[PDB]
């Protein structure tokens, strides 16, 4: 990994009717926001290689209410050991409960959103 590639991290979301979550992902000297999004599919916010060990980037799932719909996903892994580039972070708040993989199959269950 020496040119490597922006890493893009995708926030999925699909319990089904009136999914919901406001996902605020933002750290390592970097800005995003704070959305919200209806149960569609992919919600996919992208990075380089600059919010690394940094204080890489979180994604947190809260909503226009109390917590009520909230959970802490960590969007990346600040472990400079495995190589990225050609990686991508899939979070989905989901059905079950909130999928923590970087992988190129279907994630695992890892968090859990609230509502």
């Not at 994604?59 to 050609?86: S, W």
Request: proline share 5%; charged share 30%; net charge positive.
């Amino acid at each position: 990994a020496m040119g490597c590639k922006e890493i893009e991290i995708v926030i999925k979301n699909t319990l089904g009717p009136s999914r919901i979550l406001q996902y605020h992902c933002r750290s390592g000297n970097t800005n995003v926001g704070v959305q919200y999004l209806n149960f569609k599919g992919t919600r996919i916010i992208k990075f380089k290689d600059d919010g690394t060990e940094r204080s890489r980037w979180n994604c947190l799932f809260r909503q226009g209410i109390n917590m009520k719909f909230f959970t802490e996903v960590e969007a990346y892994r600040p472990d400079l050991k495995h190589p990225l580039c050609g990686k991508r972070y899939e979070l989905s708040a989901r059905m079950d409960a909130i999928y923590f993989k970087m992988d190129e199959r279907p994630p695992q269950p890892l968090n859990k959103w609230r509502s």
